[PDB]
Design an enzyme around this catalytic site. Sequence first.
Site, mmCIF file in Angstrom:
data_model
loop_
_atom_site.group_PDB
_atom_site.id
_atom_site.type_symbol
_atom_site.label_atom_id
_atom_site.label_comp_id
_atom_site.label_asym_id
_atom_site.label_seq_id
_atom_site.Cartn_x
_atom_site.Cartn_y
_atom_site.Cartn_z
ATOM 1 N N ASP B 92 13.128 3.122 -3.833
ATOM 2 C CA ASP B 92 13.978 2.140 -4.651
ATOM 3 C C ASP B 92 15.106 2.731 -4.486
ATOM 4 O OD1 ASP B 92 13.727 4.529 -6.097
ATOM 5 O OD2 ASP B 92 13.258 3.594 -7.964
ATOM 6 N N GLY B 94 17.693 3.528 -6.645
ATOM 7 C CA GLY B 94 18.212 4.499 -7.477
ATOM 8 C C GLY B 94 18.939 3.871 -8.730
ATOM 9 N N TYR B 96 18.008 1.743 -10.953
ATOM 10 C CA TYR B 96 17.224 1.967 -12.218
ATOM 11 C C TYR B 96 17.332 3.066 -13.059
ATOM 12 C CZ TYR B 96 13.660 1.359 -15.761
ATOM 13 O OH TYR B 96 12.916 1.421 -17.074
ATOM 14 N N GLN B 182 17.900 -10.813 -9.944
ATOM 15 C CA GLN B 182 18.087 -10.515 -11.265
ATOM 16 C C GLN B 182 18.556 -11.974 -11.947
ATOM 17 O OE1 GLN B 182 17.549 -7.840 -12.552
ATOM 18 N NE2 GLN B 182 17.400 -6.255 -10.900
ATOM 19 N N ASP B 259 4.266 -2.470 -7.676
ATOM 20 C CA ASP B 259 4.298 -0.967 -7.901
ATOM 21 C C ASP B 259 4.075 -0.803 -9.399
ATOM 22 O OD1 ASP B 259 7.441 -1.214 -8.000
ATOM 23 O OD2 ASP B 259 6.866 0.636 -9.199
ATOM 24 N N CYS B 297 -17.454 0.818 -9.426
ATOM 25 C CA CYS B 297 -16.254 1.393 -8.710
ATOM 26 C C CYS B 297 -16.914 1.864 -7.520
ATOM 27 C CB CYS B 297 -15.483 2.448 -9.364
ATOM 28 S SG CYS B 297 -14.243 3.167 -8.492
ATOM 29 N N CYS B 299 -15.333 4.354 -5.754
ATOM 30 C CA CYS B 299 -14.457 5.511 -5.254
ATOM 31 C C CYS B 299 -15.144 6.714 -5.468
ATOM 32 C CB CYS B 299 -13.353 5.601 -6.354
ATOM 33 S SG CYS B 299 -13.500 6.625 -7.878
ATOM 34 N N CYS B 302 -16.245 8.253 -8.730
ATOM 35 C CA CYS B 302 -17.493 7.418 -9.657
ATOM 36 C C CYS B 302 -18.820 7.806 -8.717
ATOM 37 C CB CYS B 302 -17.125 6.013 -9.596
ATOM 38 S SG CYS B 302 -15.860 5.706 -10.635
ATOM 39 N N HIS B 328 -9.457 7.773 -9.208
ATOM 40 C CA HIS B 328 -10.242 6.856 -9.650
ATOM 41 C C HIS B 328 -9.293 5.487 -9.992
ATOM 42 C CE1 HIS B 328 -12.722 3.877 -11.796
ATOM 43 N NE2 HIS B 328 -11.971 3.892 -12.660
#
Lengths: 362, 362
Positions: B92, B94, B96, B182, B259, B297, B299, B302, B328
Amino acid sequence: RPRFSFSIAAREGKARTGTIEMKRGVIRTPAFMPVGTAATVKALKPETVRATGADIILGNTYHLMLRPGAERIAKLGGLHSFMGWDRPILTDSGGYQVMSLTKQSEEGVTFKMLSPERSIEIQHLLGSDIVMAFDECTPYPATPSRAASSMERSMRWAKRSRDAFDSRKEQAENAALFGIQQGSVFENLRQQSADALAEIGFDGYAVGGLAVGQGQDEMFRVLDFSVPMLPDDKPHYLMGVGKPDDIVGAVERGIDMFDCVLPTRSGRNGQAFTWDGPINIRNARFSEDLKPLDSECHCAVCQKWSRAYIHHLIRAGEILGAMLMTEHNIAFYQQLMQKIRDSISEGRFSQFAQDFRARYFA
Amino acid sequence: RPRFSFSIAAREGKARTGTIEMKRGVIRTPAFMPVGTAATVKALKPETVRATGADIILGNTYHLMLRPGAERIAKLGGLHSFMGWDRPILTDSGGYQVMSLTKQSEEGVTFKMLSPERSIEIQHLLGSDIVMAFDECTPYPATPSRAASSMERSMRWAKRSRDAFDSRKEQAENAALFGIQQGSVFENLRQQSADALAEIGFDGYAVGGLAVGQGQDEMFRVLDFSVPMLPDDKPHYLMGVGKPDDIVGAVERGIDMFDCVLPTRSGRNGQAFTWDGPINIRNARFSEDLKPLDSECHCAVCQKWSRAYIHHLIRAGEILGAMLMTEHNIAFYQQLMQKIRDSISEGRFSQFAQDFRARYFA
Ligand SMILES: CCCCc1nc2c(=O)[nH][nH]c(=O)c2[nH]1
Ligand SMILES: CCCCc1nc2c(=O)[nH][nH]c(=O)c2[nH]1
Ligand SMILES: [Zn+2]
Ligand SMILES: [Zn+2]
């Protein structure tokens, strides 16, 4: 595999290398046991602990009986299943922590009851492979009168521990029981204690009370006369030791097993072990150092990340910094134990110890 | 692989699935980007992030320029080498954080200078694969006058960002540049903004300013008219979103990239995502629950540990609890994105979304 079989394959002076065979696996000796305090080796998955070369880990009884509780862990399938470590686990009795973190009596200790019988039952509930007798870790220093009274109670407790363990068929058939020698720094009391322990009979013998304030010189002095007192053909376990150089010197004096929180705790605080001695990775000198923590280390951390990155992580308080430092430190300890075993096997351990010390202390 | 190639393989309504090809790898879309705030996805090794199915991660520029510093990371070999992630990284700008964690002017922002040119240079120094234009994330709510003034400055900044990026041969040849729309919640300002952005030309288009206090209904309302304004043939990135149900609804409205810190941050605080909704693992009801976090799940967490154990870890403040919960949660988000991609590919995404919502909200 048998319940318990300790075999010595090679010797050099007082040093020994060999194996302890147990139902859940083989332990290569001299052995270093990472400490899992509350059913976790802090900041490591158990697979990672194994990957570093650990054959066995230590669990603290005191902390587990408080959280999450022994009966609860048993209901859940025992400690191995709970935490996901399927190899041997040694548990301490609780005797040390109940005093350091009370009402003491001949029955046991009450705190905000733990006794030989309860301690052994808790270790059973946890499903411990190596059970420690419930003892009293005598403070250092101690007057001979006080150390004698303390040792004597511990030996009465050792007999109670023996009988409590034997009274439970499944525990007696599947686990092992170690006795713990006390007597502070006094030769005659250490002998009395060894004698008492051998008369009872245990699967292994710990040297207790030497990780509680003694400097290395003193600890070594006491080991010099204390380890030969123990049965030769059983493992010798030095509780709570120690620094890499403590461990080398103790193997030189006949110890087979070690535990201590230094590699984990140190690691989280920014201390990394190297063959040239510990370094504090928070030091500004590492901010742009592209080398691994240690130039020779074969661990995953040293294969992949730089001092500079780990420096950043620890200064930033990042969890990954604790994880990486801990993995490296535990791997370093395991590589130390491997080098010790190989050098004894090859009859060049005395030279290894000399070489290790010259470089570690330079 | 090319510097940048976005291909749409299948569509369903406004939803799309496809790939972004870049020099450091392929990104499957719709994509979820785990957030690495200070050159680490908190409590995960990069290998673990990959293992969960992530194709790309986000790095925050603000935090890196402060610690360890952009020039320093560049000197050390760039962010990919520093942190050990060799696949694409989106950074990103910066813009924000400099306002949320100042002296604002047309030049940029001064704080305890960041400007379009400096932001793009920092992202270059980091070695970012996807560079975000330096913008202003308009607070929510905002009056139309204020949102217009803010949007207009962002669009002037977007042109400056474009030119700063193009002026650096190695960056222009090896990275991609995204613009950020925006205009707050106002249709006419969102159109003006899209128009401005398209005139400049970018490799992808983010929808900015919608993760700053709007409820889902409102965010969806704004997406309804805002995403069709963007070039169809380029990726659409919704910054900072969001909850599993936010993500499904946004894909339904044409977003390709996401994200947010929720899976990591939530995870450390005891919230675990399941197909039946989030659960707070600290709740006493999980103390003896032997089930995995989620019944379906795939993963590693799990496969191996119970709710009971993770409950213990989080209540105890254990690092391994943060590690397991985070792995997880990130794996859950990746399985969600995989289910989304597969269902669009098979023309049954609308049904998937219905089914997902019926169960997640039951
Ligand atoms: C701070 C390290 C303490 C190591 C330790 N010593 C001892 C001992 O002497 N007896 N029993 C124990 O559990 C024990 N643990
Ligand atoms: C708390 C989540 C904030 C997400 C975000 N929005 C924005 C935005 O609207 N512009 N630029 C950014 O970096 C940015 N990041
Ligand atoms: Zn290492
Ligand atoms: Zn899972």
